[PDB]
Amino acid sequence: GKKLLEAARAGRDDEVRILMANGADVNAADVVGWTPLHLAAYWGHLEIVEVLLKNGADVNAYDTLGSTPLHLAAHFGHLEIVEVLLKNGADVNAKDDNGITPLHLAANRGHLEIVEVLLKYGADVNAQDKFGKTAFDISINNGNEDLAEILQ
Amino acid sequence: GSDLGKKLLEAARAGRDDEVRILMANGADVNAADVVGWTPLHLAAYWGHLEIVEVLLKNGADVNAYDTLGSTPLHLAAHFGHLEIVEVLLKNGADVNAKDDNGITPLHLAANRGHLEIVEVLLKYGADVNAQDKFGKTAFDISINNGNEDLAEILQ
Amino acid sequence: NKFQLTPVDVITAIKAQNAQVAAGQLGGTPPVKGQQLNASIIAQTRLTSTEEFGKILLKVNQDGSRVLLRDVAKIELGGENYDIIAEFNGQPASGL
Amino acid sequence: STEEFGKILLKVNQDGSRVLLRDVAKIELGGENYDIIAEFNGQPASGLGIKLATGANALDTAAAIRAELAKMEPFFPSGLKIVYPYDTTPFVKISI
Amino acid sequence: EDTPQFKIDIDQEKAQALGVSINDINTTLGAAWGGSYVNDFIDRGRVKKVYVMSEAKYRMLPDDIGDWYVRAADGQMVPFSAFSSSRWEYGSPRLE
Amino acid sequence: LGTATGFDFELIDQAGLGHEKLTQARNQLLAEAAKHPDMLTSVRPNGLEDTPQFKIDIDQEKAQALGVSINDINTTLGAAWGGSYVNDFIDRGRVK
Amino acid sequence: LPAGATQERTQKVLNEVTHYYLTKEKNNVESVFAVNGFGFAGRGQNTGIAFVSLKDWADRPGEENKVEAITMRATRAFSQIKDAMVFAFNLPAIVE
Amino acid sequence: RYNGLPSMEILGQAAPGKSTGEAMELMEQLASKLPTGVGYDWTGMSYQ
Amino acid sequence: PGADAKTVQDTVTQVIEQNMNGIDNLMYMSSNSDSTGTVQITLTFESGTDADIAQVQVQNKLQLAMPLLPQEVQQQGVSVEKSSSSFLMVVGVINTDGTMTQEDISDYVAANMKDAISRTSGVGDVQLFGSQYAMRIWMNPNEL
Amino acid sequence: PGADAKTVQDTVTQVIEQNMNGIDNLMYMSSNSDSTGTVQITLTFESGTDADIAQVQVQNKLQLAMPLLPQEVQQQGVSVEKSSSSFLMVVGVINT
Ligand SMILES: CCCCCCCCCCCCO[C@@H]1O[C@H](CO)[C@@H](O[C@H]2O[C@H](CO)[C@@H](O)[C@H](O)[C@H]2O)[C@H](O)[C@H]1O
């Protein structure tokens, strides 16, 4: 499974293939709680995210700070991966230890397409973080008008 | 002041036993003092010259001389850990409870530097364990502040 | 003036909010033996864009209203100084 | 000394009790850093890794280093000993 | 290769609301987890450094962050957890 | 060239012995030299002997109880008794 | 070792390296001076270096007992160390 | 201080009819009997 | 102290590098900024370049950057050295009575041996394999 | 200004001395720290050393030690000069 965490990070589709077909834990977690899915989501490896989920990867796995792969994908603007994760039952309103949601993150980075998908899947627009901020609050603060209008 | 007085102040400080010997034979002023009011006995006590301390006392030195800030040779001996000098001074009438201008006693000074044997000698000669300096501190207060548990035990 | 602020307040906020902080490490030396994790802690980093400078928070009003730097200033990339302007055959240019 | 640092007075409480540095910290002589730890043949050691200044003579410099080390040895604490784990210069002298 | 690092965001607005200075926040964080060279002292006749830093056991775990308190203007002690949020990310341990 | 006949010797504290012990060893050396008039003449220190100095202790507790800062105390003392270079002015076209 | 690796893990790998020279190269190796936390990087929790001194050429007769064959055998044995890059090598005539 | 360590400089000369080398050799002899941790060096005209 | 690699680069390395110009005989320049809080900048010169002048010219430019560096960096001491990259030798120090720990010996070496060696002509750079003692104040957040 | 010998030695002289490394052709170094608030450190070089190069190397190591010195010493400045004892002449100026 240590082989899997690494292969997942490097986006070695073929290698994930084996290890997979040799029964490596698909939900293997590293020192910070990241699974192979967190890693593929972060580094933008769509094909590996797909395989992983097809092999029973916990889609709502969370790291030691309560963050899920959907958080990572939404934050780093991986639209494809966001769609795939949601289609596989990713909790759209997942909150990390800070009360931060994938919607908060996408909104912060101004990822418009992604923000729309999340909403599509029923992301709660009024969800507040620990500081009581909504994605709307964020869009306003960043002076992002195209985004603020949507959150409406 | 006198020339022999100056020579005695210097010999006492440097621990030149023999020169002191000769100076005593020639009547060098044992009560000479420099600008800060230190006598040959102050110097000998500070620098730890035991034999000179004893010679000076035999030649009529003032055991309780005080400098311009009110400090005595017992203060000095106690502060710098000269145990046998401390004992000799006390044997010769040194004021065990002498306060300098700051209200500091020889006991305060020995406690401050953690000189356990000197502390015991001072208590043996009647040192006042409850004496307070100008800030209201006792030897015990000093011991705890320094975190000296052995000393704190003794002063209980 | 409207917000009861000065350039002193602007300068103070920029220093506080455009900052690059040495924040140390988790599991750094000397560690508790048996420690498995060693990671840098990343706190504030320098701002990188006019957008980021514009949302520097100068103060919030009693009614929770926020005064952002962009509310008292125009924010833009522009020359460190504006004293030198060259032309090549009458056309805007730079040079060395 | 650690004793002196320990009694640094941080504050006096409302009731006149004292808060000393030693009340909020452990106080000890310890390295500026704790990153570098050496062993010689498996035992505790320290050492100096020396690099030659540009253009300097390797053999002359090594002789001056040894001459300086020899001035230090007689004042070592008991048991302290210089060892010679790595030297590029003997090969030069011997091969010549 | 890049490695996991711990990203902490100080919330400016919350800090302002609670009256905690950014300088106190950054010094507390940095001194505790990174260490701080304060000034010099004399060790057996030689000038050497004085360092303040958290004892090892309080700077090993992410959860330890919220055990550090800063004093606000109104004299109240406020935990890091009240004005910050954190997340894991990747970054470089060595930039060429 | 000093004297053709003269020598220039340095006594050295090799082990953090401190000023007083160095002084004692110096004196021990000078006393022995003085017993060889047949070989050594005018063996003497080049420098200065210790002198009385006025040691003043600031009571931190009392300062804190009175609300007097150590910094005001120490600059008041140093500026008054030792003098303090404040800044520069211009006296007939020359900075002083 | 990979960045993120601990000083304790680096020590374990260094112990293996030292052990190898002390037991499998008894006839060739005079001493090993190993340093945890320093490499040509330099500093880091995840790096180390061992300086190795060989017995005199006269006691090392034969190709198999010269540096090239020793370093080659060593690297080969060390290749079977998990999660670390460890290799012995002879310096060139002129690195430059 | 001398070469970075606390020090005290001592001047003197060879007695009449005596070489400075001889005087220096004695000083070294005497210096060898001083308390533990006390060393010495020659500087200036003597260094040469 | 306590800086991550990007903080070192963006607050120290870039600043010094931007001041490195008008230096004679420079072939190239390279640098590492790391999460130990350390920067090393190496300037390599044409064969035959007088190293004394190269060092003087580098430092004249460095001193223009110095005031722009964080106070904590200036206080650690920045250094400019002219030495080979490889070690000439390693002088090791042990205690045969086993009566001094690794930390004790390192402090002894740092405090009593290192400076005189570092001052010796021909010695371009000295690395201590260990660390000099400091007074360590180890804070406890609970008590604070 | 106003410093006693020990204050000068322990905040100025030792710090400067500790930084007099990597300078070519040094024979020895000596210093006096005195109660007039003054320090002089003299570095003497091998005969044949280029005096200008010796001086610039010294000045350059000092420059890098300046941030370690007390503020009031940085304010007075630290002079680095070629040492000479011969005067061509002394012109006195008096008022009669
Ligand atoms: C027919 C005559 C042959 C020899 C004549 C000698 C003439 C002058 C020689 C002087 C210069 C060096 O001479 C030579 O140096 C080397 C280096 O230490 C030594 O040669 C070496 O012996 C063994 C093996 O050969 C080495 O492992 C060792 O390192 C070294 O001692 C020799 O013992 C010495 O004789």
| Residue ranges of domains in chain E, CATH in brackets | 3-91 (3.30.2090.10)
Tell how far CA F34 is from the center of its chain.
27
Looking at chain F from residue 22 to 41, which residues have their Cβ under 8 Å from any Cβ of chain D? none
Bridge pairing between strands G29-36 and F94-95: unpaired
Stretch (H or E) spanning I44 = strand I39-45
Alpha helix segments (H runs only) across I1-144: 5-8, 14-18, 51-65, 71-76, 102-112, 114-118
Question: What's the Rg (C-alpha) of chain C?
Answer: 21
Instruction: Give the chain I residue whose CA is nearest to the CA of G33.
Output: I92
Distance CA A43, CA A41 (A): 6
3-class SS string, G27-60? CCEEEEEEEECCCCCCCCCCCEEEEEEECCHHHC
The tokens 């750079």 sit on which residue?
I125
Q: What is the resolution of this structure in A?
A: 1.9
**Method of elucidation:** X-ray
Distance CA E68, CA B93 (A): 59
CA dihedral A75, A79, A84, A86 (to 10 degrees): 50
Taken in order D58, D61, D63, D68, the sign of the CA dihedral is negative
Q: Which CA distances in Å does J77 have to E47, F10, F78, J69?
A: 21, 29, 19, 10
CATH 1.25.40.20 fits B1-156, yes or no: yes
The ranges assigned to domains in chain A are 1-152
Distance CA D31, CA D43 (A): 19
Query: Structurally, how many domains does chain G consist of?
Result: 1
Residue I41 bridge partners (DSSP): I31
Name the CATH topology of A1-152.
Answer: 1.25.40
Instruction: Give the chain D residue whose CA is nearest to the CA of E45.
Output: D1
Candidates C36, C37, C55; nearest CB to A143: C55
Q: Which is the closest atom of ligand 1 to the Cα of G58?
A: 27
Q: Which is the closest atom of ligand 1 to the Cα of D94?
A: 17
CATH class of C1-82: alpha beta
Using CB atoms, list chains with 3+ pairs below 8 Å to chain I. Answer: C, D, E, F, G, H, J
Domain that holds residue G58: 1-96
Stretch (H or E) spanning E90 = strand E84-91
Q: Which CA distances in Å does C52 have to A142, C69, E10?
A: 8, 10, 15
A54: its two tokens = 């097809």
Looking at chain F from residue 26 to 85, which residues have their Cβ under 8 Å from any Cβ of chain B? 27, 52, 59, 61-62
Q: Would you list which residues of chain A are within 8 Å, Cβ to Cβ, of chain E?
A: 30-34, 42, 63-65, 67, 71, 96-98, 100, 129-131
**Residue C41 and residue I4: Cβ atoms within 8 Å?**
yes
Residue F10 bridge partners (DSSP): H9, H41
Alpha helix segments (H runs only) across chain C: 7-17, 50-54
Query: Which of A62, A68, A76, A97 would you mutate first to test chain E, the one with the most E CBs within 10 A?
Result: A97
Contact call for residues A43 and A11 (beta carbons, < 8 A): yes
Stretch (H or E) spanning B46 = helix B40-47
Residue B114 region, left (φ>0) first, then alpha (ψ -120 to 50), else beta? left
